[PDB]
Design a binder for this molecule. Structure first.
Ligand SMILES: O=P(O)(O)OC[C@H]1O[C@H](OP(=O)(O)OP(=O)(O)O)[C@H](O)[C@@H]1O
Ligand SMILES: O=P(O)(O)OC[C@H]1O[C@H](OP(=O)(O)OP(=O)(O)O)[C@H](O)[C@@H]1O
Ligand SMILES: [Cl-]
Ligand SMILES: [Cl-]
Ligand SMILES: [Cl-]
Ligand SMILES: [Cl-]
Ligand SMILES: [Cl-]
Ligand SMILES: [Cl-]
Ligand SMILES: [Cl-]
Ligand SMILES: [Cl-]
Ligand SMILES: [Cl-]
Ligand SMILES: [Mg+2]
Ligand SMILES: [Mg+2]
Ligand SMILES: [Mg+2]
Ligand SMILES: [Mg+2]
Lengths: 379, 208, 378, 208, 379, 379
């Protein structure tokens, strides 16, 4: 049967690989001190879309609860559920959460992109410091390195505070802010140059696009009013520390883009976007957000997007010879079944056949009888 | 092919884009109108050209079958320009998206029917005016639709207004201004900026 | 914040346990030859509810695909998706599948039931023999035993073929058949006695509810016409075989109820219901069903195992904030190497952000004494 | 207009439908090729003709702006002929809907990309073959798409096969047979049957 | 605000006209001996969707009764409610009912259709004869003619019995039946000719689509077995009588389509579709249906679809002069109020102004004080 | 069949009466200068619940638009739709609207109260003056007098401004404000008295409850600061003008209750509640509310609650004699049917029989042929 766009079966060795990835990545996060939570697929919209952006609201399927008549949603994002859990269980100190679960989107993000990602993530609540963003990076790269991929992760750092602070100091209208954001998104430098010549501190807004990439010299290019703003100064310093940590500790290729302003409404500071090879949609999205005055920072990724970039060792797929098995006396069957249980405990996939034709898919070995002894022979 | 693939709309956009391409060191080596070829080499051996129907230019660029292209803002608004960078307004093939109806005819009291290629733009425009509209997708010419009662109004691009007046129609509301834009594939913008940048500068300088 | 009824968070140690259970059980099924498949949460209703009963349809939330205008459903049962997968990939021979995923129900089934179970299951397609049913039982019980629960599984066996044959032979109408199912559903013997007196082969239909539990003598109590029916004889024989297999192989207390007819439209033969302790909703549902292609299988809600299973106490380690900060860059890398080893062994090690950063359930501190890091219990 | 409005496609449809109209007593009063007109009167004062792009013919007919029309079966399948009656196989412009790909290039093992005008036909066809596909809508010519890697295959109408072979492409799978069909609006069939019947009879007699 | 698709405000003169139409047509039906009933907008689904087709169930919004936890539906069709009312109040004799009320549909019925029609209808229960159908036709045409429209109603007649009978005689499978109905809905004669060559009695099934319009000769074209079937012969004769009645009594243009099979599950005999001008969706739908053994026949229409084709007289919109009214003493005010009440009783729309700027929309006349007397003058 | 609670059939003579009332009351409103509007039953919640109270939100049934996947509601109140219509069509001046339409409520208001009222109302936008509220009363009581009821309409007048102004001048917390409202709603004078001893301007809050019924002396009973407050002075004056107008012009019994504070967040001034006999839930509710700063004032009522208090004249239900009719020639038939048309024009309900046994319900007269002349005879 035809499936909807952005909806695919994950089958067989891909499914097995997805299972191993989900489990090992979850276990890693647990070993770094993150508490695993498994919130449900559905909730009342009151909780699920509390303080949601317009985008998230549109991305969430709506359904009616037949016990109350109230509106529920199928989650498009696990992070609002983590806010809820933390508000009830987290206290005022630091709290660490991880998770891995299916989310559904009404529309795909990328061309032929998935609407049914297996979203895995980690979040730290209750820490103001850049140290929390540094810990998340350490955990993410520890996980990425465990996967033994040949694909290279390229990291893009931004920081929404810089533009937001410039917008305030320039006293930009909403329509002016939206026009700058569209031009940044579209990399339209020539039209940006013209809009910036007629704006207050337009030379700073054009500088973000033209020289944001060079973070070591960014503060010293900005205006005197921007250089006197502590939030802008802090934001740039945060970018420098993260960049240094990603090169030193992890030897990561890091680009800076302070004009990266997607999720303008949920992000509140430093942002990271991890891109795999030359794929357009980032594999990892992370950054600062609000704990609706609770501090929060986190990342997530679609586990199913790792499948194309990871490999497991070829599986041993074993068939017990039907005719030879059914010639055995009872004692010989018991000894064979003990051998089979031992193979199974080591991860061999052993089929006990129901018929002479019973043939597992991808068969690699037969457990056959040769001179009163049971051995594996390659097909 | 390791170079840049350029996707161009046939007709008026092609005619007004030839000088910009000439100035950027990219001339076609033959007339596309007189040719069976689909892929055209240029004087620059790092660039080749595809001549496409206007509405296909964003599709080829967004999927990476072309690295960059020239398309009218009308096509991009209707298509949705989400997956490409609109790097440059080229200020060529200027025209207006407008609504148009039969000459002097009054608006009927029942709900308005709109016949147009620009279906998404029509819905978006009448949404901002607080009018509820029935919209009919057309692929070809739209001037006939009001005359045989298919729609009450059409939405189409208008330059002089001569095509509308010659078919017994008049321009009603101005939706927006249109011109041709340079669009770039997001991957190509990173991986092939060295090849792209001289050409983008030459286009930018030509427009001055 | 409040959640809908039958919708629960699984949190912290319970979430860890759910993940361990899911993974172990899945890996067990894989090692028995079952192909793992992970079908999507949503599909067009065309495929997802192809030949679905009215109950499966009612249990399925519908949503609209904005791209096509078509109705999609959020799956309430994974088995229909296995059918689709088998139809395309499985051929004419024997095929084995397993799965584990979330399913969603519009209403809870039964008293305080969940609407968001983590449905785990296994299915064998293409084998008519009772041997496939025996293989599934053995797999199931091997999985149950591996959990090392003190809770006990009671198995209730049914077989829809017995009633379906009697209904065809007696030429019952739809409304008569439905009336008998309602009366069977809460074993209303007094009213069943009355209704059966006016119906053809009514004493057979009364005999099922009244003496169906005694499977060794059930055939002897049915009418002569029913006793000559080959499918009825086979069905009763299948029940005797599985009961004996469960008793001999697994020491399992088995009850028989041949009027267990819930899911009348999807079950085509033997049906299996496993109850944990005295809990009202069965933990394990299984049975024969349609693929002409034979199929049989079971599923369970993994989240219902959480109250009856236990993991070893976790080791939750905090590195001393002040000692860590006083370390030079080379010393830091040695500690991190030592910490990476602790994590590989399954210790949960928190690197503190502040001197007040405390993990929940702290068991051990990692502390610097005489140029050496060691674990101390708190 | 109280008579019948006939919607015709430009090109092969128009040229091959003119004789059928002539036998039915309907002649255009002038040549469409050399005319700016959109609405054409005929020798029969109860019939007028519209010349449309082929993909718009079913639209005009289903909305009743045309009472009847001639349209390729490929266009009707793609559009959906749910609101019109398909009365006659005129047996003109006979051809096949087919998949096509690069000459001698074997299928990649990965998920297939189909670039085509016939999006709905492609989805239906590959669904019936149990093939998961990514479908890309094209409005223009489809022969370029496999050659710049936009898709692995195209779905298009094929007659001789010469256009495919001229572009380095080869026909692969047969989807279905295609010919021009006479379509009629449901209300028109009910209300104007007296005007329709002689013309439909004439067409039937001309074809059999 | 922007309203959903198929959902429209009826405002001002259109609302006034809708009210006039609703009321006039209701009173006409009442004066022909039809008992007005006004069932509620919502009921339990048990009653409202008892014996409903899959089409009606998909068209009915469901909602939750908080008092019982049970499902209710917003009615998509008033006829199931009339069944309920007739079952309790109607007896075994002939009963006549009429109604006019809002109904809601989940999806539009067709091309740009309304989802909120004002459904007005009439039904006769307890008469098997074709005479009941002829009375409904006569009442309907009388209602239509009272509206004095220049728009013309074309009537299309069908009869589901003909096809249903052939389906039983041919012993068609459910799939064959569904295929034929699909091909009939598009009158796809090329593919129907192919499908019918491999079907039992396929000659007849093709003949229904090819020649069903020619009702005088339809019987002779059918197979010997189909000609012996009494119900087929009766159905064809019923069509002929209605056709003759409509042409003779009403000068109505009638078409016949015996393959008109929408509402296959609710219709039990003759069907009737009235098309206004060239509009795609029928204005009037009616036909024979099943009571709960009880004969029934009826029609319904969307009153809202009459608004574009009907006209009221121009209203008289009157404004009392503000200054002159305020100059009056108490006893002169009371006389003016008596005069105004009289004008209002004649149907003049009289505004008493709150200010000197208070101006009714569509003003036609002023009431002005000249020489101690109030008189109307046009603007 | 069982209907849900608060859901009833209106049948036969009750249905006829409801039809007559809806229409006549509607025509009366139109003749008073109010523009009829008929908004739809369903809207997107965005518009329908824009600025709604929590109660209106809870009272509104939710459903999903299958064309967008957005939330819609079934209207529980027509007034918000009138705001929407007025925002788009009303302009800056005065605008008058009326309506009559079904609304649906999730829960009943009164004990055994309706969940499916036929809501009829009228609203004036853009007039700040008490003159607008007096015009609404004139319209309302003109309508009530046309109903010729024996039942007596008692009117309660309140004015929320008085309490709101005192609360602002007293610097009451939200907590104290809520406590006073609870005590006012429950008529607990003793606890009010105690609570007021420790509140700023406590004696004024007590004075409202104890002496607010005596509106002629209320101002002189208040504290110096409350006496002088402009909005309090105006409010009390508004209560006096409205009382005097009701008693004098309309012979209506008026009680004052300035502690009537339900709908605290929607009402912005004077409130009106009309009670029929000793029924607990008011028949008519009205008052000042917000447009949009746009002034608005209005009332609404359930038309179905008038059914038990109104009467029509007994209907004439006529049956044409079957045998005599069928015995007529075509010209005689024609003469009879003109005579029947005249009877029907006068409101006679004339059934044409389909059989000899066709008998209308509630038969009063037979139209019988005797001595070659058709006449009515009582049964
Ligand atoms: O206002 P005017 O100067 O008359 O130009 C407007 C025309 O341009 C557009 O067509 P397009 O340019 O794509 O085709 P064309 O060159 O054949 O008109 C449009 O559909 C009009 O036909
Ligand atoms: O197999 P062949 O005989 O080469 O014909 C097939 C061609 O016909 C169609 O062209 P279109 O309808 O655009 O007409 P055209 O070929 O005249 O452009 C289609 O787009 C194919 O390219
Ligand atoms: Cl994700
Ligand atoms: Cl013009
Ligand atoms: Cl590239
Ligand atoms: Cl389950
Ligand atoms: Cl598409
Ligand atoms: Cl070829
Ligand atoms: Cl027509
Ligand atoms: Cl209707
Ligand atoms: Cl009300
Ligand atoms: Mg998130
Ligand atoms: Mg299952
Ligand atoms: Mg009906
Ligand atoms: Mg109101």
């Amino acid at each position: 049967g035809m499936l909807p766009d952005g909806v695919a079966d994950v089958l067989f060795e891909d499914a097995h690989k997805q299972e191993v990835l989900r489990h090992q990545l979850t276990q890693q996060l647990i070993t770094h001190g993150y508490q695993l939570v498994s919130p449900p697929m559905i909730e009342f919209t009151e909780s699920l879309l509390s303080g949601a952006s317009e985008d998230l609201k549109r991305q969430t399927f709506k359904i009616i609860d037949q016990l109350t008549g109230r509106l529920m949603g199928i989650r498009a994002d696990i992070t609002p559920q983590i806010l809820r859990i933390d508000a009830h269980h987290g206290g005022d100190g630091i709290a660490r959460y991880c998770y891995a679960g299916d989310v559904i989107h009404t529309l795909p993000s990328g061309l032929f992109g998935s609407r049914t990602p297996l979203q895995l993530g980690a979040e730290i609540f209750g820490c103001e410091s850049i140290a929390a963003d540094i810990e998340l990076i350490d955990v993410l790269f520890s996980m990425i390195n465990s996967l033994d991929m040949s694909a290279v992760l390229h990291v893009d750092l931004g920081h929404v505070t810089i533009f937001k602070r410039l917008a305030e100091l320039a006293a930009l209208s909403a329509s002016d802010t939206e026009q700058l954001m569209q031009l940044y998104a579209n990399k339209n430098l020539p039209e940006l140059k013209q809009v910036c010549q007629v704006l207050p501190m337009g030379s700073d807004f054009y500088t973000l696009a033209r020289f944001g990439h060079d973070i070591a010299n960014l503060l010293g290019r900005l205006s005197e009013n921007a250089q006197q703003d502590t939030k802008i100064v802090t934001a740039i310093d945060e970018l420098q520390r993260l960049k240094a940590h990603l090169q030193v500790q992890w030897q990561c290729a890091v680009s800076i883009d302070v004009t990266e302003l997607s999720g303008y409404h949920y992000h509140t500071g430093i942002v990271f976007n991890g891109y795999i090879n030359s794929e357009t949609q980032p594999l990892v999205r992370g950054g600062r957000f609000d704990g609706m005055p609770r501090q929060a920072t986190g990342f997530s990724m679609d586990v199913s997007r790792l499948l194309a970039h990871t490999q497991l060792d070829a599986p041993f797929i074993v068939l017990i010879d039907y005719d030879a098995f059914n010639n055995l006396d009872s004692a010989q069957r018991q000894l064979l079944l003990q051998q089979v249980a031992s193979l199974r405990q080591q991860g061999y996939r052993v089929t006990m056949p129901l018929t002479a034709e019973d043939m597992p898919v991808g068969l690699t070995h037969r457990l056959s009888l040769a001179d009163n002894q049971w051995r594996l022979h390659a097909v | 092919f390791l170079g840049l693939t350029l996707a161009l709309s046939k007709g008026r956009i092609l005619e007004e884009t030839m000088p910009l391409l000439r100035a950027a060191g990219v001339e076609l080596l033959e007339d596309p109108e007189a040719s069976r070829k689909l892929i055209f080499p240029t004087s620059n051996p790092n660039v080749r050209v595809l001549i496409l129907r206007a509405s296909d230019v964003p599709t080829y660029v967004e999927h990476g079958a072309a690295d960059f292209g020239v398309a009218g803002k009308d096509v991009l608004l209707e298509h949705g320009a989400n997956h490409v960078y609109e790097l440059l307004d080229l200020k060529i093939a200027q025209c207006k998206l407008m609504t148009a109806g039969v000459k002097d005819a009054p608006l009927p009291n029942r709900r308005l029917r709109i016949a147009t290629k620009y279906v998404n733009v029509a819905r978006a425009y009448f949404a901002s005016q607080g009018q509820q509209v029935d919209v009919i997708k057309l692929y070809g010419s739209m001037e006939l639709a009001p005359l045989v009662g298919l729609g009450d109004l059409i939405v189409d691009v208008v330059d002089t207004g001569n095509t509308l007046r010659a078919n017994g129609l008049e321009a009603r509301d101005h939706i927006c201004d249109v011109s041709s834009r340079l669009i770039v594939n997001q991957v190509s913008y990173k991986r092939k900026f060295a090849l792209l940048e001289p050409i983008l500068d030459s286009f930018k300088n030509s427009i001055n």
